[PDB]
């Protein structure tokens, strides 16, 4: 009507060139660089704070909030790109469905009696991104959450699935997790744990037990299962505990020696 | 040394917050790039037709 400017027209092959050219610009490299940066910052912070200094809980909470915000950003960016591709597919299908303007179909579209899909309206009507079907649980997040307790004491039992207060009401009765293996009187240089056994092993003597037998029972108690080589994975918690224990024992030995010399 | 370490930790957490702020600002830039571009693409299709 009036000025012959139709609201929308069917897609053209020349316009199809640009439609295929249009894409959402990526953040995969940016996101992975950010993730690696925050992970290495957490790793540095693990031993960065002075052993006598206490109160890393607020910094841990702040870093947890930062990581959660980053993960939410990544999830909604994935939502962005999937929405973009779905919108492109819907628009191309609608354009293919609609006819082509040759003689007066353009006039009909201009008069408004005929309508064609418009990417602007579709992008205005696309649903807002939703952080659904996404879980903010990573190994870095887990170690970040559990590191304050390890800092407080090397032996801790954080899970509260059985009871929110502790493992059993107020008393854990969980014993201690020893850095030095009775089998191998040495710190765990290769901490390997099973998703089923949930026990950390040095693997130096475990390979000797697992050679010649396809599956062998877990030597530790409180469980009964057989595992192979490929069920073992690296557990950062174990060497985190080892490092904090060594650092604390070094600082306490230095303090006691210095005070004893000050006595003389 | 401990005071300097604490100051560096505070500085690095401040930079972490700053780069978190730059995050989703980069996403808003990405959205304002992809948006207002499809409208001009529609104008290009208008010209082509």
UniProtKB/Swiss-Prot annotation, chain A:
GO terms for molecular function: protein serine/threonine kinase inhibitor activity; SUMO ligase activity; SUMO transferase activity; zinc ion binding. It is found in: Nucleus; Cytoplasm. The keyword ATP-binding does not apply. The keyword Zinc applies. It comes from Saccharomyces cerevisiae (strain ATCC 204508 / S288c). This is E3 SUMO-protein ligase MMS21. GO terms for cellular component: chromosome, telomeric region; cytoplasm; nuclear envelope; nucleus; Smc5-Smc6 complex. The gene is MMS21. Zn(2+) binds at residues 197, 199, 218, 223.
Swiss-Prot record, chain B:
This is Structural maintenance of chromosomes protein 5. Component of the Smc5-Smc6 complex which consists of KRE29, MMS21, NSE1, NSE3, NSE4, NSE5, SMC5 and SMC6. Belongs to the SMC family. SMC5 subfamily. It is found in: Nucleus; Chromosome. The chain holds residues 747 to 795 of 1093 of the full protein. It comes from the Eukaryota. Signal peptide: none annotated. The gene is SMC5. The flexible hinge domain, which separates the large intramolecular coiled coil regions, allows the heterotypic interaction with the corresponding domain of smc6, forming a V-shaped heterodimer. Sumoylated by MMS21. Present with 892 molecules/cell in log phase SD medium. Acts in a DNA repair pathway for removal of UV-induced DNA damage that is distinct from classical nucleotide excision repair and in repair of ionizing radiation damage. Functions in homologous recombination repair of DNA double strand breaks and in recovery of stalled replication forks.
